[PDB]
Design an enzyme around this catalytic site. Structure first.
Site, PDB file in Angstrom:
ATOM      1  N   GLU A   2      37.469 -35.928  38.404  1.00 42.63           N
ATOM      2  CA  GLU A   2      37.297 -36.100  39.834  1.00 42.63           C
ATOM      3  C   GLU A   2      38.656 -35.977  40.534  1.00 42.63           C
ATOM      4  O   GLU A   2      39.659 -36.543  40.086  1.00 42.63           O
ATOM      5  CB  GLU A   2      36.660 -37.467  40.125  1.00 42.63           C
ATOM      6  CG  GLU A   2      36.658 -37.844  41.603  1.00 42.63           C
ATOM      7  CD  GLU A   2      35.961 -39.173  41.881  1.00 42.63           C
ATOM      8  OE1 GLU A   2      35.653 -39.445  43.064  1.00 42.63           O
ATOM      9  OE2 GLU A   2      35.724 -39.945  40.925  1.00 42.63           O
ATOM     10  N   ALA A  58      40.933 -36.911  43.714  1.00 43.44           N
ATOM     11  CA  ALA A  58      41.044 -37.862  44.824  1.00 43.44           C
ATOM     12  C   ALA A  58      41.846 -37.209  45.944  1.00 43.44           C
ATOM     13  O   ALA A  58      43.063 -37.072  45.837  1.00 43.44           O
ATOM     14  CB  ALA A  58      41.698 -39.149  44.368  1.00 43.44           C
ATOM     15  N   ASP A  93      43.880 -50.856  33.709  1.00 40.49           N
ATOM     16  CA  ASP A  93      45.169 -50.798  34.388  1.00 40.49           C
ATOM     17  C   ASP A  93      44.975 -50.535  35.881  1.00 40.49           C
ATOM     18  O   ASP A  93      44.512 -49.470  36.278  1.00 40.49           O
ATOM     19  CB  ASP A  93      46.057 -49.722  33.755  1.00 40.49           C
ATOM     20  CG  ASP A  93      47.340 -49.493  34.533  1.00 40.49           C
ATOM     21  OD1 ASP A  93      47.819 -48.338  34.570  1.00 40.49           O
ATOM     22  OD2 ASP A  93      47.864 -50.465  35.118  1.00 40.49           O
ATOM     23  N   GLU A 119      50.504 -47.509  40.724  1.00 43.05           N
ATOM     24  CA  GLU A 119      50.762 -46.142  40.259  1.00 43.05           C
ATOM     25  C   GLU A 119      49.557 -45.544  39.539  1.00 43.05           C
ATOM     26  O   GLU A 119      49.533 -44.353  39.232  1.00 43.05           O
ATOM     27  CB  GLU A 119      52.022 -46.052  39.381  1.00 43.05           C
ATOM     28  CG  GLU A 119      52.219 -47.204  38.425  1.00 43.05           C
ATOM     29  CD  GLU A 119      52.927 -48.392  39.073  1.00 43.05           C
ATOM     30  OE1 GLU A 119      53.368 -49.298  38.334  1.00 43.05           O
ATOM     31  OE2 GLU A 119      53.055 -48.419  40.315  1.00 43.05           O
ATOM     32  N   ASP A 132      42.347 -42.588  35.181  1.00 39.94           N
ATOM     33  CA  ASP A 132      42.102 -42.681  33.746  1.00 39.94           C
ATOM     34  C   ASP A 132      43.311 -42.168  32.963  1.00 39.94           C
ATOM     35  O   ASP A 132      44.109 -41.386  33.489  1.00 39.94           O
ATOM     36  CB  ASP A 132      40.862 -41.857  33.378  1.00 39.94           C
ATOM     37  CG  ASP A 132      39.690 -42.100  34.329  1.00 39.94           C
ATOM     38  OD1 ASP A 132      39.057 -41.106  34.764  1.00 39.94           O
ATOM     39  OD2 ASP A 132      39.404 -43.283  34.645  1.00 39.94           O
TER      40      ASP A 132
HETATM   41  O1  LIG Z   1      50.490 -34.723  46.101  1.00 42.10           O
HETATM   42  C1  LIG Z   1      49.418 -34.508  46.550  1.00 42.10           C
HETATM   43  O2  LIG Z   1      49.263 -33.783  47.734  1.00 42.10           O
HETATM   44  C2  LIG Z   1      48.199 -35.032  45.821  1.00 42.10           C
HETATM   45  C3  LIG Z   1      48.370 -35.742  44.630  1.00 42.10           C
HETATM   46  C4  LIG Z   1      47.244 -36.228  43.964  1.00 42.10           C
HETATM   47  C5  LIG Z   1      45.970 -35.992  44.499  1.00 42.10           C
HETATM   48  N1  LIG Z   1      44.821 -36.401  43.732  1.00 42.10           N
HETATM   49  C6  LIG Z   1      44.533 -36.595  42.338  1.00 42.10           C
HETATM   50  N2  LIG Z   1      43.220 -36.782  41.937  1.00 42.10           N
HETATM   51  C7  LIG Z   1      42.943 -36.908  40.619  1.00 42.10           C
HETATM   52  C8  LIG Z   1      43.964 -36.861  39.729  1.00 42.10           C
HETATM   53  C9  LIG Z   1      45.298 -36.685  40.141  1.00 42.10           C
HETATM   54  N3  LIG Z   1      45.584 -36.539  41.421  1.00 42.10           N
HETATM   55  C10 LIG Z   1      46.453 -36.627  39.323  1.00 42.10           C
HETATM   56  C11 LIG Z   1      47.434 -35.778  39.845  1.00 42.10           C
HETATM   57  C12 LIG Z   1      48.597 -35.559  39.098  1.00 42.10           C
HETATM   58  C13 LIG Z   1      48.768 -36.180  37.845  1.00 42.10           C
HETATM   59 CL1  LIG Z   1      50.210 -35.875  36.842  1.00 42.10          CL
HETATM   60  C14 LIG Z   1      47.781 -37.029  37.334  1.00 42.10           C
HETATM   61  C15 LIG Z   1      46.630 -37.236  38.074  1.00 42.10           C
HETATM   62  C16 LIG Z   1      45.562 -38.165  37.551  1.00 42.10           C
HETATM   63  C17 LIG Z   1      46.206 -39.386  36.910  1.00 42.10           C
HETATM   64  C18 LIG Z   1      46.116 -39.588  35.530  1.00 42.10           C
HETATM   65  F1  LIG Z   1      45.526 -38.646  34.744  1.00 42.10           F
HETATM   66  C19 LIG Z   1      46.662 -40.737  34.949  1.00 42.10           C
HETATM   67  C20 LIG Z   1      47.310 -41.690  35.741  1.00 42.10           C
HETATM   68  C21 LIG Z   1      47.407 -41.491  37.122  1.00 42.10           C
HETATM   69  C22 LIG Z   1      46.851 -40.342  37.703  1.00 42.10           C
HETATM   70  F2  LIG Z   1      46.974 -40.137  39.046  1.00 42.10           F
HETATM   71  N4  LIG Z   1      44.307 -38.032  37.617  1.00 42.10           N
HETATM   72  C23 LIG Z   1      43.563 -36.976  38.252  1.00 42.10           C
HETATM   73  C24 LIG Z   1      45.800 -35.275  45.681  1.00 42.10           C
HETATM   74  C25 LIG Z   1      46.928 -34.795  46.348  1.00 42.10           C
END
Ligand SMILES: O=C(O)c1ccc(Nc2ncc3c(n2)-c2ccc(Cl)cc2C(c2c(F)cccc2F)=NC3)cc1
Length: 265
Positions: free
Chosen positions: A87, A89, A132, A136, A150
């Site tokens: 998913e 976000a 967790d 962050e 996750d």
């Molecule tokens: O910068 C923007 O404009 C921006 C940044 C993020 C989002 N949304 C989003 N949605 C899902 C995930 C992630 N980011 C995400 C992004 C990068 C990385 Cl290195 C990890 C993940 C993760 C994650 C994870 F696996 C373990 C722990 C924490 C996590 F956050 N999970 C999917 C939208 C815009």
């Protein structure tokens, strides 16, 4: 029933670097459904020995569905990499919001706490504890609602933020640092640390050294800034009990007067 492959996805912009690969903004080709594609390099997984941990969490994660838990739609692999279909976000990282604003007001914080208490209560019902929920590891959905991320072990702590070890210590219950057994009551403690951090902008026990932080957690000594209201002090104080047994049940957090009065939902 359908089987996913790399070709099914249009890979857009990279969202960030994990320890074993990158995460990308992606669309499923037919439905154009937007999602996050997380890539892991297998040989690297094996060498860090997280290979079997990954498999366990995927099995567990795959059975979890909740409005405030980032959803694992599925996954696939080739000979070199594993791909996690997650998913997306759309509103990004809570931790960044927290530094942009420095701290959150009571309405925002209490609504967040409601969302998390619902998520954690669902988890408990699925025999999943010690999730967790440090900032962050919290993302924001399209309605500004919290999303618990996750596989937090696969990503590095934000540079602008607390480092991994410090970050984790900040949220550890006294029983887990004093090496005792632990249960679901661990999640009540994290909720309390979070509530405090949301309202104040820094976790309650953080000191200059790991040693002092450890000491402060063990003794449950922290102070409220003057601007924290009585209702918040009451809830946080009920959450940060040294004896896990004296911590509230999640339903009691959900019905707590400060939560009821300040929450949007
Ligand atoms: O910068 C923007 O404009 C921006 C940044 C993020 C989002 N949304 C989003 N949605 C899902 C995930 C992630 N980011 C995400 C992004 C990068 C990385 Cl290195 C990890 C993940 C993760 C994650 C994870 F696996 C373990 C722990 C924490 C996590 F956050 N999970 C999917 C939208 C815009």
């Amino acid at each position: 029933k359908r089987q996913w492959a790399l070709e099914d996805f249009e890979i857009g912009r990279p969202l960030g670097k994990g320890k074993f690969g990158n995460v990308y903004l992606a669309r499923e080709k037919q439905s154009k459904f937007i999602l996050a594609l997380k890539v892991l390099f297998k040989a690297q997984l094996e060498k860090a020995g997280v290979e079997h941990q990954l498999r366990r969490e995927v099995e567990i994660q795959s059975h979890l569905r909740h409005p405030n838990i980032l959803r694992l739609y599925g996954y696939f692999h080739d000979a070199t990499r594993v791909y996690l279909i997650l998913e997306y976000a759309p509103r990004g990282e809570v931790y960044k919001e927290l530094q942009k604003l420095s701290k959150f007001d009571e309405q925002r914080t209490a609504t967040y706490i409601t969302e998390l208490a619902n998520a954690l209560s669902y988890c408990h019902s699925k025999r999943v504890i010690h999730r967790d929920i440090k900032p962050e590891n919290l993302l924001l959905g399209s309605a500004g609602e919290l999303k618990i991320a996750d596989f937090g072990w696969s990503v590095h702590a934000p540079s602008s933020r607390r480092t991994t070890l410090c970050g984790t210590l900040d949220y550890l219950p006294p029983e887990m640092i004093e090496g005792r057994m632990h249960d679901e009551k661990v999640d009540l403690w994290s909720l309390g640390v979070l509530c405090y951090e949301f309202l104040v902008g820094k976790p309650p026990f953080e000191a200059n050294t790991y040693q002092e932080t450890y000491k402060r957690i063990s003794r449950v000594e922290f102070t409220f800034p003057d601007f924290v209201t009585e209702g918040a002090r009451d809830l946080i104080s009920r959450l940060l009990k040294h004896n896990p047994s004296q911590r509230p049940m999640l339903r009691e957090v959900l019905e707590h007067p400060w939560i009821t009065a300040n929450s949007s939902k």
